[PDB]
From a paper:
Recently, we reported that HIV capsid hexamers possess an electropositive pore that is essential for RT and infection. A ring of arginine residues (R18) within the pore avidly binds dNTPs, potentially explaining nucleotide transport into the capsid interior to fuel RT. As previously, we used a mutant hexamer protein that is coordinated by disulphide bridges between monomers through the introduction of mutations A14C and E45C and with additional dimerisation mutants W184A and M185A.
As predicted, IP6 strongly stabilised capsid hexamers, moreover to a substantially greater degree than ATP. This suggests that hexamer stabilisation by IP6 is likely stoichiometric, with one IP6 molecule per hexamer. To investigate this, we solved the structure of hexamer bound to IP6. The electron density for the complex confirmed that IP6 binds the R18 ring and six symmetry copies of IP6 at partial occupancy were an excellent fit to the data. This illustrates that IP6 can bind in a number of alternate conformations, with the axial phosphate in different orientations. The N-terminal β-hairpin of the hexamer adopts a ‘closed’ conformation in the IP6 complex, with IP6 itself located within the central chamber, above the R18 ring. Despite the fact that IP6 is not planar and does not bind parallel to the R18 ring, alternate R18 conformers allow each arginine within the hexamer the potential for hydrogen bond or electrostatic interactions with a phosphate. The structure therefore indicates that IP6 is tightly bound by the R18 pore, would effectively neutralise the abundant positive charge and is likely to coordinate and maintain hexamer assembly.
Author numbering:
A (entry chain A), B (entry chain A), C (entry chain A), D (entry chain A), E (entry chain A), F (entry chain A): 1 to 87, 91 to 176, 188 to 219
Write the structure that this text describes.
Amino acid sequence: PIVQNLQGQMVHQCISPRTLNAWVKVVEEKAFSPEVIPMFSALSCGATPQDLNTMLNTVGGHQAAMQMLKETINEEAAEWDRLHPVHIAPGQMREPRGSDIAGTTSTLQEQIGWMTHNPPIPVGEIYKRWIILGLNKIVRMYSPTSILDIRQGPKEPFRDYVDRFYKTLRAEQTLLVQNANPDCKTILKALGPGATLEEMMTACQ
Amino acid sequence: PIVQNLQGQMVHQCISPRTLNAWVKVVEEKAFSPEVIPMFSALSCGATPQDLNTMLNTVGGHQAAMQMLKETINEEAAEWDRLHPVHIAPGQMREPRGSDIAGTTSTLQEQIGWMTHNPPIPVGEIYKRWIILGLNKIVRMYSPTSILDIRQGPKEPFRDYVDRFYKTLRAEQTLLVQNANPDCKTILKALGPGATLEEMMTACQ
Amino acid sequence: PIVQNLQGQMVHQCISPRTLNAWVKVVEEKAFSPEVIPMFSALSCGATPQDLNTMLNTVGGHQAAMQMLKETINEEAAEWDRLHPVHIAPGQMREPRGSDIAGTTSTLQEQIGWMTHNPPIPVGEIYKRWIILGLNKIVRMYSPTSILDIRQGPKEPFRDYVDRFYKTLRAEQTLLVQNANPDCKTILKALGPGATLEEMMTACQ
Amino acid sequence: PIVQNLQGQMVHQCISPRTLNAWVKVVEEKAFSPEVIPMFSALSCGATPQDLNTMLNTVGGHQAAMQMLKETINEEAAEWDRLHPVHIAPGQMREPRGSDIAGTTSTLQEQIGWMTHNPPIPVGEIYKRWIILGLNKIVRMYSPTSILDIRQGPKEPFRDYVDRFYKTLRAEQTLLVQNANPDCKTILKALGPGATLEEMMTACQ
Amino acid sequence: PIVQNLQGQMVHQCISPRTLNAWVKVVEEKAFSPEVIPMFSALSCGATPQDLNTMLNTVGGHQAAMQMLKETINEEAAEWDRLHPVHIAPGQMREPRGSDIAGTTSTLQEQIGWMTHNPPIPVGEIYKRWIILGLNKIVRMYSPTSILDIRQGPKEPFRDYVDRFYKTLRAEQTLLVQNANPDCKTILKALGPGATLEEMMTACQ
Amino acid sequence: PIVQNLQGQMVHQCISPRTLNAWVKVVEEKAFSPEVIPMFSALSCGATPQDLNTMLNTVGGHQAAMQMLKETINEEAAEWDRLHPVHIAPGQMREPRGSDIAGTTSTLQEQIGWMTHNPPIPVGEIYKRWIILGLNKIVRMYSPTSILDIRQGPKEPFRDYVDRFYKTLRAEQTLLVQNANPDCKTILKALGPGATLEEMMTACQ
Ligand SMILES: O=P(O)(O)O[C@H]1[C@H](OP(=O)(O)O)[C@@H](OP(=O)(O)O)[C@H](OP(=O)(O)O)[C@@H](OP(=O)(O)O)[C@H]1OP(=O)(O)O
């Protein structure tokens, strides 16, 4: 990553073993549950394209997902190249292409040079947006169940039903009342319209 | 978070993997037991709105609770907007709206700019107050038992009863004597009024 | 806590996740065994009143003990207010009351201001003394056995007996010879007076 | 490794116990699965030849692999010596030979001297390229199965098949359709040409 | 402890939770095996008397041992007071007594003042010598077996016997040949005098 | 150890609990497998003689080995004294003897003084060479099997045989073909001379 030292210049620091290990574990434990994406974003704070490639490449399973992600990255890179065509002056900074942003045709020195320029060309932030676009599609694809099949069981506590319902909506990126069991549905119908979630959960407790 | 370096300027630092992992674990282990709230407050010391959103978004379960929290945050944001209406001068700091404080319509650069201004606009401290308001309502809602149902068993040591009693009061946010078993109740009645808790526990040992 | 940086000014630092987790675990594992108190004192080195409240508030069980501690803290605060009455000049440091020292009516900024003043008002050290007074009473109360009931068994090695004896004395805050078994008691009587513990343990080995 | 301190000079730092332990574990757990190579590259960021030799030498098993790697390193060193022949001036920097780059005939002081020269001779980056060449050959050799033997089972979900297929291709460094089961193959044939992987996985879900 | 910062002044630093936890564990796992003493010495590098008392006081068991240690410390303190009698000038450093060195009648500020004086009065190093004197007596006392009872079994490999023999000598602070079994004893007698341990172990392999 | 701070002077730092614990564990887990030696060398980077003695003394078992090591160290120290005889000028640096290099008759202050002198007397590097000489003899002695007894089993995969073969050669510090089973031996004989290990392993797969 690129960090500010104790004296206030932006410098390159090695990715820590703690960071590397945290990412690999979360993917092992959680696969592409939606909460993996904000964890990815937090663990890659200040990342260079080189560091982002490290994090993706260190994943050993889920290789269908990692191929789908490469495809998304190649589409965003090709759209970058459409919007930002490029033409080198000795000693001067060249303009990045899509494949430079994705870290496949650029060196770590060029990446640092772009990211610490005045004004900077935030190649790490741009690449991370492409990656997250790709990861969101994977989360959606790996979602096991439609929101239409989340219905409250006859003996299921309302809180447990709402937890399943919002967990599914999150992964898929009045239905709550419609899919409630007969007993809660009655209670909820009687609350009247524009009830908060707190009020519905209180009523059905 | 925003920290002071070794040379005494306020600078942005990445959220640590240690911090991220501590929060996720405590929610996995403790759910919305009341002691989770002072842990949240301690783990988010110096946080930007971006960092607070990271911590909330990295929770994978309890999605009914996290929806209730979004609702509370939207109410506080709307009250902010009532009290502090806003109208940009090139290069100058804009005034934050509710959604800027909650980190949904502001960038990390704007958040740092507000929090390190002279004088600062403590957007992270303001947002954290809204979050804690929301978390306290959740703790109260998830409290399993009324204080009225905490009564000392015929064979239950007085200390164990008092522990259950104050654990429940804490989550719900002379009753102690009234709910004691016959044997302790006698002892306690005879101590006379304005006995300390130490004196009651000593007497019933 | 308040620490000296690498350049020698006293500055505020966030409580670490390592510190927070160490305290919670030691209370989970050891409850109010006497050795918990020197651990508390070591983990709270340089603490502000805010940090001390964090550490106490993050404990989830033992809520009878934490209520007894609040009582002790309120007594010490009221005695502070007796000895040090208070009357604000724009921009000037106000004098702390008992409730300021205990961190309930003071901000973190005021606490840092007191603790780093020339000369300082060590509000964190004062509060920590009150807490430790309260914790010692709890250790004493939770002591399972009287020293009078620690007697050496007919087959118990003398070393194991002495370990139980001094473990109990520590928690309760010639008896050793009197409570020894017949065989050691004989040996010990014959050593004559003013024998060291090393000499008694050697003799009874 | 060679790192920049807080004041911006390139200095030598000891390899951390965290780094050493991370590498040894990943080799214990993953052997020569392909994802071990990007982990090696990330854990050896800024490494001297001495540090790279440490990491290789601390591996206790897989000694057939570590002998094959020595062979590859000796070939690259001999090609270095072909391209860059060498001839010492008192106090002056000598030119490195292949065996200097691999750290067997150079001291740590010479290695730092080369790597921090203006302009630098990046002996650590050169050696790491040789090592990675050698590691890729080992990954290929230890690949258990040909891509030709990865075929979708009659009851195997398409996603699980694609995961095995791309895991194998990765280690070996229209076949996907040809090796699909009869049911998916039909669906896939009907999609028409130039379907993305996302579209094939959606269709076969 | 007292450490040098990044800028080269000697300053006080809080004892780390890592240090505190390492000590407590090693005593839990190893009791007073001899290797506990060099671990104590390494974990207390730069310690103040306050820090040394922390480390001793955080031990929960072995209270017979910790009482024996207090006795040894009181003897060394009384001998200090014999050799170095003391008589305060406003603002000036007082001379330490035995009980000041052991940290019972001195403040942390006085301890830092002594240890960082020019020239320094190394109260932490002096106290640590007293503690180690006391710990060595405990190791000796807790030694389970006399060296006279370490004899090689008829089926015991010579290496395993030598390991037990030197483990015992270490704790107790030609016998090796005399206590060998008949078969090795013959081999060893025939080697002739002034054989190294390597030669004896080779011969008996 | 002696490290460079953030400002570029060589200063003494305490051995870390992480370092201490890593060494003790690796000896517990691996005994004197050959890979323990490069781990020792990496964990003792920048060590003073005091730090090296700490690491050796913290090992609790293998006391026959640690006695053999003391013997080797005493031989190297006596050869040092032969090559470098010594004769003190008030305030001046004395010349080190063998026992000074091994840290038994020198203080930590003298050791730092030598190691940071201009030019330095690298007492830590010299002692570490003696230790490693001693450790290599121990690895050799504890090697369980002769290379002559490593032969490929009739059902043993060639890769597994080569792993055992090079693991043994490493500890002992055309035989490969001679000790192969009949089936591989045939294949290998037919490859012709000067085949690489990669080619032999490919052929026998
Ligand atoms: O790995 P160790 O040598 O035991 O030391 C570590 C380590 O910090 P260093 O990288 O400076 O060694 C940690 O880093 P990670 O391995 O987790 O990346 C860190 O944990 P944090 O990341 O949360 O800082 C930590 O400190 P903590 O005590 O807060 O766990 C600390 O251990 P000690 O400071 O106790 O020695």
